[PDB]
């Protein structure tokens, strides 16, 4: 008997689930990484064409398991009918943004593995621990974590010049709308994409604590208040070819130390690399070298 404790109470599984459905980001990759092809998982809403709806590392693993991708058409929100049609024995939502009502509705379909605290606030190691336990594979989950950690360490050790360059650099992950720079998003330390950076040797600036009290996974702040993040050595943001220059020319954002120094890592918007920034055991293997190279080049400019 599997007992799960999460934000909405307790989920009981009578035995290891035969059929596995997942929702939201990343969860399907934990299953796949453990050798399980989901009977259904959320269509990728970012990093790849909706026509395709599945990220390259996920696709690759599915093929390696001789399986096929069954996607829930749920770009606009949870598709309860589709989930129900997959006839699951468990629904992995260890990393997700489900509400009480969502949890109650899903639970009528099958036992739900929900997040521990607040929506979208599950780090990658915790994602594995929650999801792997719900699969009745807790031990395999621990092993998967150690193996993923070793993959990370291997890339860092293998490239000392990148490792030394980013080590101890104070970093913030942000989302900046090029069309409106009067405000932007900063991701909190409880967001997996912000926390992953610490696995790579970077650290959070002092100013991040100021967001410890934020209830959400990210906080939108005014450019008039951007001085707050002058303590970051390097800044990471989604964007494109024009992003850095537009930022450096911005009358308010251009004054920020890291931006002024050109210490900004621009992740190509809506690409696999962008999507990988919320890491999974599969995405890391696939993208870490590429990611480290972008991070290393940006940290080069930290003064
Ligand atoms: Cl190197």
Numbering used by the authors: 39 to 341
Tell me what the authors wrote about this structure, in their words.
In the complex structure, a molecule of ferrichrome is bound at the center of the inter-domain cleft, with the iron moiety sitting against the bottom of the cleft and the backbone pointing outwards. As shown in the electron density map of the complex structure, the inter-domain cleft captures a molecule of ferrichrome with Λ-cis configuration. The iron moiety of ferrichrome is pulled to the C-terminal domain via three hydrogen bonds with residues Arg231 and Tyr225. In addition, the backbone of ferrichrome is stabilized at the opening side of the inter-domain cleft via three hydrogen bonds with the side chains of Trp158 and Asn83. These six hydrogen bonds keep the ferrichrome to adopt an orientation with the iron moiety pointing inward to the binding cleft. In addition, the methylene carbon atoms of the hydroxyornithine moieties are further packed by a hydrophobic barrel. This barrel is mainly composed of four residues (Met213, Trp223, Tyr225 and Phe255) from the C-terminal domain and three residues (Trp63, Tyr84 and Trp158) from the N-terminal domain. Similar to most class III substrate-binding proteins with a relative rigid linker of α-helix, binding of ferrichrome does not trigger significant conformational changes. Upon ferrichrome binding, the Segments 1 and 2 missing in the apo-form structure undergo significant conformational changes. As a result of induced fit, residues corresponding to the two missing segments are folded into a loop and a η-helix, respectively.
To obtain sufficient iron, S. pneumoniae evolved two major highly conserved iron ABC transporters, which are termed Piu (for pneumococcal iron uptake) and Pia (for pneumococcal iron acquisition) systems, respectively. Pia system is responsible for the transport of hydroxamate siderophores such as ferrichrome and ferrioxamin B, whereas Piu system for the transport of heme from hemoglobin. The overall structure of PiaA is composed of an individual N-terminal and a C-terminal domain linked by an α-helix. The N- and C-terminal domains face each other to form a hydrophobic and plastic cleft.
